[PDB]
Design a protein around this ligand. Sequence first.
Ligand SMILES: N=C(N)c1ccc(CNC(=O)CNC(=O)[C@@H](COCc2ccccc2)NS(=O)(=O)Cc2ccccc2)cc1
Ligand SMILES: [Ca+2]
Ligand SMILES: [Ca+2]
Lengths: 51, 234
Amino acid sequence: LCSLDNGDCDQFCHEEQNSVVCSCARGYTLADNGKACIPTGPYPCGKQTLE
Amino acid sequence: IVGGQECKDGECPWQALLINEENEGFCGGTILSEFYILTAAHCLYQAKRFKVRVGDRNTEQEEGGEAVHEVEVVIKHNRFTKETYDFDIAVLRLKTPITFRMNVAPACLPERDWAESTLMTQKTGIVSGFGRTHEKGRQSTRLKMLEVPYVDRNSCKLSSSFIITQNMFCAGYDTKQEDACQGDSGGPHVTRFKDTYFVTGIVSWGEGCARKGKYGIYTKVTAFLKWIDRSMKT
Ligand SMILES: N=C(N)c1ccc(CNC(=O)CNC(=O)[C@@H](COCc2ccccc2)NS(=O)(=O)Cc2ccccc2)cc1
Ligand SMILES: [Ca+2]
Ligand SMILES: [Ca+2]
């Protein structure tokens, strides 16, 4: 269930075929584990900037 | 912003400030990408011509991180009307792309269903801007941010003297003296999720600022995601 801790997804969670399917916003690519979202550039959307 | 805190270095990078001829900020906006800014439609009546400044946190001086951008295209929602403040949303396309850097970065656009079931069901969101720090005061020179609790939709309707349409939601406190205010309009209301911030609202209106028994009213972004995509696509 996506209702269970967002299905362990980093960002978007969908309950397709009774199973979890995670996706990401633009600027990120889904990780090999199909859960984490990996940034593509130095300034991915939604991240505060440390430098 | 009434109460809350000052946005520290790199804390509110998606904040945008609309400035008039005198380089005075009159409304806020949210950076969606290098060419697009999200703001409120009622901000388009607050000034003849205007520009968009990013990376600013103090309008009293020039640090060297700020950057001004001219507005190429203005896309205001056709159904907007000052009579109800419904459909209070607009998207601006800049002539030149924003250079992302310290204090300058976009906020993420979430998906509709996920946003409504996971982001708007969170305890709080965050609103920011250079608006007034008090109801009768002047515009703030420092960018401020404020954690605003999501407000039960029912409680809000009962507290409002005006109609709360399905294109708006409320946030803030019933009596605590913290709230967005005039000048913050068009500004961002973002929701944090696992260290990633998603745009969830647009500073729209309110009966006064931080008044007891009253909340802050924001344009419900999830209700315009498709409209926003179209505006950015075409
Ligand atoms: N969170 C917040 N507290 C907040 C955030 C942003 C803004 C900026 N936007 C505006 O002011 C839009 N104008 C209004 O809201 C009018 C009219 O409100 C009634 C209404 C009529 C028709 C349809 C729907 C509502 N109120 S005010 O009390 O005169 C606004 C003000 C408050 C303080 C100093 C100056 C003006 C204001 C308050
Ligand atoms: Ca400055
Ligand atoms: Ca209040």
